[PDB]
Amino acid sequence: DIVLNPLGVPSRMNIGQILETHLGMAAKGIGDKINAMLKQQQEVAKLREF
Amino acid sequence: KPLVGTGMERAVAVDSGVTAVAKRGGVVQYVDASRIVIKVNEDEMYPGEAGIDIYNLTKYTRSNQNTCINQMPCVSLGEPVERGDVLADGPSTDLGELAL
Amino acid sequence: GASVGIDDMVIPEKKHEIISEAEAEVAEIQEQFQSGLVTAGERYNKVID
Amino acid sequence: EFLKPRLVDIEQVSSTHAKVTLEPLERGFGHTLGNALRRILLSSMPGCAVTVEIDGVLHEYSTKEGVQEDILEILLNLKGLAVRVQGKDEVILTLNKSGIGPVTAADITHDGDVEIVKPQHVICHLTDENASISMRIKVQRGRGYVPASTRIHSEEDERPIGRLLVDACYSPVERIAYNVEAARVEQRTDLDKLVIEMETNGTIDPEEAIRRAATILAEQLEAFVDLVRSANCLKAEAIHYIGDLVQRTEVELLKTPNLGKKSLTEIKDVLASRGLSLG
Amino acid sequence: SVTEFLKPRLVDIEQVSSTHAKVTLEPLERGFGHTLGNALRRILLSSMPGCAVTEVEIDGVLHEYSTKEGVQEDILEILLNLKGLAVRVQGKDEVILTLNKSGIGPVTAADITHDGDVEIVKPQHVICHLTDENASISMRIKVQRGRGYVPASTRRLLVDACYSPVERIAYNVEAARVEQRTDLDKLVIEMETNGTIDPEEAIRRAATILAEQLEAFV
Amino acid sequence: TTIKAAKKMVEREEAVVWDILDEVIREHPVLLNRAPTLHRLGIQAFEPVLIEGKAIQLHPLVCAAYNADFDGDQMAVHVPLTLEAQLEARALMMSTNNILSPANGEPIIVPSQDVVLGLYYMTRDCVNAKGEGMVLTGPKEAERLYRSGLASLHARVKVRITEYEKDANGELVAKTSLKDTTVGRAILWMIVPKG
Amino acid sequence: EIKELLKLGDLPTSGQIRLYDGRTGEQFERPVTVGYMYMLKLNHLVDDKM
Amino acid sequence: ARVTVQDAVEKIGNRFDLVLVAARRARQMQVGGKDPLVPEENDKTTVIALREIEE
RNA sequence: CGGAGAGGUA
Numbered sequence A: 001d002i003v004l005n006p007l008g009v010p011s012r013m014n015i016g017q018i019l020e021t022h023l024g025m026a027a028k029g030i031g032d033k034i035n036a037m038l039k040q041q042q043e044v045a046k047l048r049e050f
Numbered sequence B: 001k002p003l004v005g006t007g008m009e010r011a012v013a014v015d016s017g018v019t020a021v022a023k024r025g026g027v028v029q030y031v032d033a034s035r036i037v038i039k040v041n042e043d044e045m046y047p048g049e050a051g052i053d054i055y056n057l058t059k060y061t062r063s064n065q066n067t068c069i070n071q072m073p074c075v076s077l078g079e080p081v082e083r084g085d086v087l088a089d090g091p092s093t094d095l096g097e098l099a100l
Numbered sequence C: 001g002a003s004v005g006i007d008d009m010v011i012p013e014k015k016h017e018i019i020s021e022a023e024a025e026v027a028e029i030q031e032q033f034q035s036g037l038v039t040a041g042e043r044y045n046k047v048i049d
Numbered sequence D: 001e002f003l004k005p006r007l008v009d010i011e012q013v014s015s016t017h018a019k020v021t022l023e024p025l026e027r028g029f030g031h032t033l034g035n036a037l038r039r040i041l042l043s044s045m046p047g048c049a050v051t052v053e054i055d056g057v058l059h060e061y062s063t064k065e066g067v068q069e070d071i072l073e074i075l076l077n078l079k080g081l082a083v084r085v086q087g088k089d090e091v092i093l094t095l096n097k098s099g100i101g102p103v104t105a106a107d108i109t110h111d112g113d114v115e116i117v118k119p120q121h122v123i124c125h126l127t128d129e130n131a132s133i134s135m136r137i138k139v140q141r142g143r144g145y146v147p148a149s150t151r152i153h154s155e156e157d158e159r160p161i162g163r164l165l166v167d168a169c170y171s172p173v174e175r176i177a178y179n180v181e182a183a184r185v186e187q188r189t190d191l192d193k194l195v196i197e198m199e200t201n202g203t204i205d206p207e208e209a210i211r212r213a214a215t216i217l218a219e220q221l222e223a224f225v226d227l228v229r230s231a232n233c234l235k236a237e238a239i240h241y242i243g244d245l246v247q248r249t250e251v252e253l254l255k256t257p258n259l260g261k262k263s264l265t266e267i268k269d270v271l272a273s274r275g276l277s278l279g
Numbered sequence E: 001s002v003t004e005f006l007k008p009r010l011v012d013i014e015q016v017s018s019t020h021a022k023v024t025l026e027p028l029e030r031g032f033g034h035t036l037g038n039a040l041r042r043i044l045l046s047s048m049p050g051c052a053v054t055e056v057e058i059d060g061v062l063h064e065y066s067t068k069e070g071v072q073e074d075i076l077e078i079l080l081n082l083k084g085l086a087v088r089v090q091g092k093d094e095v096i097l098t099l100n101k102s103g104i105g106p107v108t109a110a111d112i113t114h115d116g117d118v119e120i121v122k123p124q125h126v127i128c129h130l131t132d133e134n135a136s137i138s139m140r141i142k143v144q145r146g147r148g149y150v151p152a153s154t155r156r157l158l159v160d161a162c163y164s165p166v167e168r169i170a171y172n173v174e175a176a177r178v179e180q181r182t183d184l185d186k187l188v189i190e191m192e193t194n195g196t197i198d199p200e201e202a203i204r205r206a207a208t209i210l211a212e213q214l215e216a217f218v
Numbered sequence F: 001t002t003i004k005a006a007k008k009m010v011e012r013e014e015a016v017v018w019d020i021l022d023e024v025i026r027e028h029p030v031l032l033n034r035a036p037t038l039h040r041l042g043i044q045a046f047e048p049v050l051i052e053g054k055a056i057q058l059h060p061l062v063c064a065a066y067n068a069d070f071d072g073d074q075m076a077v078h079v080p081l082t083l084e085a086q087l088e089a090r091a092l093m094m095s096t097n098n099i100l101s102p103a104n105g106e107p108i109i110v111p112s113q114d115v116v117l118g119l120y121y122m123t124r125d126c127v128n129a130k131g132e133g134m135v136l137t138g139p140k141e142a143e144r145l146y147r148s149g150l151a152s153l154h155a156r157v158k159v160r161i162t163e164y165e166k167d168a169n170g171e172l173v174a175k176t177s178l179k180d181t182t183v184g185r186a187i188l189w190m191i192v193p194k195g
Numbered sequence G: 001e002i003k004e005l006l007k008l009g010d011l012p013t014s015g016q017i018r019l020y021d022g023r024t025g026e027q028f029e030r031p032v033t034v035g036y037m038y039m040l041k042l043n044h045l046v047d048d049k050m
Numbered sequence H: 001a002r003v004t005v006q007d008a009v010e011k012i013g014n015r016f017d018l019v020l021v022a023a024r025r026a027r028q029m030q031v032g033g034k035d036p037l038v039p040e041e042n043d044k045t046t047v048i049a050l051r052e053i054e055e
Numbered sequence I: 001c002g003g004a005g006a007g008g009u010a
């Protein structure tokens, strides 16, 4: 969706946009594993364990 | 609903006036795009002819900076509401959480 | 495609050893000033160095 | 000397998730064809999308009674409606329901040449038995993305207050995932396969999309060469077009009993602008 | 109008004197500029029929780091003049030639044996320089037919055969405006050849090859 | 026919007035200027290029003179009218005529932040890469080799170049030899001029 | 803890993935960082400034 | 393509009288209909005038 | 087709 300039990070030292980018991808990966268990039928027993 | 937050999103959203916090608890009797009707409990009702609670959600209006200011209900019929719960999401609000 | 990640900023392996050695020096060189050997002005010009 | 590819297999993980395979492929032709087909499947692919008039509304910024959602929100979720039409290119659906309960896509009309891909697509929610909703969903067919803001010509026709324009997003393809890899031995090495993994909103067929993008690609590669009373008075004399009436002078038209007083006055008014009836 | 795509009108075709052209396709749709421009670019370099030099051996040298008296160049240097040579070959697959000559002066492509079907396109191309009246040069050049570029490590001295008869290609998408529309591409293709085939005809070659790869679908 | 007729034509925006506007825009320079005009290099002349949208495009090489980044900066446009004003825009304040600062003879068209990194990647020289230790017949063969995915951009390879030298009295001696270089540096040589 | 969160779902622990070109179908070297960042839209539009 | 005026100003090293002589010359081309001493490629009087003084 | 004050952008 967005193509940012990577050279703007070392000039103005704002690393919080690098950890949020990694943490935001991690948060989406836990939302894709549940979406897979919701797109197809899955018992609540499997959803309560993951 | 930003995935990466600091936990201070509900505090700003609830303390602001853009949302519609439930005054007294109960069960949603009639939800609507512009009105909210919740049947208050037997204890939370005043002794002499208390009745119910009615929340009139604001429609599309303009702000000081010419921005849209409208609310949207986030409840359903039969859902038991407790005192302090959020009943509507105004501008930049997602289920009682700030989202800009 | 020259990106920038969290692993592209490597911390030196002996950084912890230099800081631990530095705080150990200050923990005893400050007490040498309290004995009346050096003044507070010259000690200030020494800790910053 | 080139082993042309063939449509070998078409997998089907679900009603939306597909996986096609293109083999055999030569050296440097996997990425050459994989990218070229991806750039067409995403850009231009025909589809259908909602382009709708509700009874008790005047604009999308209003609000109706007995509906939990908002009028603009209703126009927002109607955008994501998977419709499939094979007969014509312009259909008008209808949605009528009353009583407490959600309003899904099943409740919409059951036209013969209209197939609903996701009947459980929630569109609205009713919250009062003494309420009802009635709308006419005008579905069309096109390609690409066309916003409602571009429909400001105001030189073709005018729309009533009841009409509500919606953003047209008739593009069934969502994402394309091809991947080149080494094929089997085939008694000849240096042969690679192309495994395309597409995904759509159940409104198109995998084969019907690859045979269509390749057609568009070949259609561009061919550029490889060097270089009524007034009108009834004139229609009585078998004259329907303005050219037949303008061929004769106004004096010749006035010498006939077929022309009336109103027709002669209308012809004189049109002739005053030096546009017609100039002898 | 669901399948009514615009067609480019190549109104301008400017080319340098001999082996350099510049084609400008206009107008194209949005996104087809890079689509079509790159499709033929990858094919032109990686899959293009042609003949080049594959291996040349010296009658008295069996090592890369050697030298022959009376030659102003080196044995490593004369390999380039064999690579840059452009030769058109008949339907025959391969054929070996020679460079048997003893004389003072630069060795041009005209000194190579005719060998019948072998037709040198650049007789002015110089292979090496000779200065002694008795220093004789002799080698065995072996041509071969292929498609693309084959380095030495992918494979008597080895020669990196450049079968592709195109020296370079670099397209350039631009903006073209219809009466009302403006966000439409404007492809500009720049390409140089090696003199074997004209660049104008070189486009029709790869475009036909790509058109034949889409017969099972259209 | 009359002045009023032309106004209504532009008012309705016919499809013909666009090809008529392209006529005057072709050779009519305009002046661009930002708010903090400190030196004279803040008002230059450019040739307008019609583009769809509501934003102005400024060449990323004159941003150093204007001292304008792309975080919300705005500039003001000016159109000369008379013949003298148009000629002064081309002969005195044209963007291709003001490349040296009035304070020092050093250039002011230095690119940065994407051009100096890119050329540094081509001119880089790796130790072990695909294609190391080969021979190329010039810069044109290097471009064919790299785009084909057969060799890396940074790999040592002996390449023959023909570098002209105009140091004589108009004559250009065409020195030809075999220099030791990489793939990236060879492809960049196709841009360097003769002299 | 971010890397451990990237190990629950099937995601690369390094954080940087390998992307392909969209106009040439080529593979970019030096695999880039791709994630999910929360961007905002300031009330500075070009329609109120042109 | 009137990209630069280097070769123009090298002949007459003033850069001020050039604008003056070109303004008068281009005015005689526009004000009164005439054929430019040089061929035209759909240019204006300003470009044609500067192109004429090039020689 | 104004005068002061406040806030914001480069």
Ligand SMILES: [Mg+2]
Residues within 6 Å of the ligand: F067, F068, F069, F070, F071, F072, F073, I010
């Ligand atoms: Mg700025």
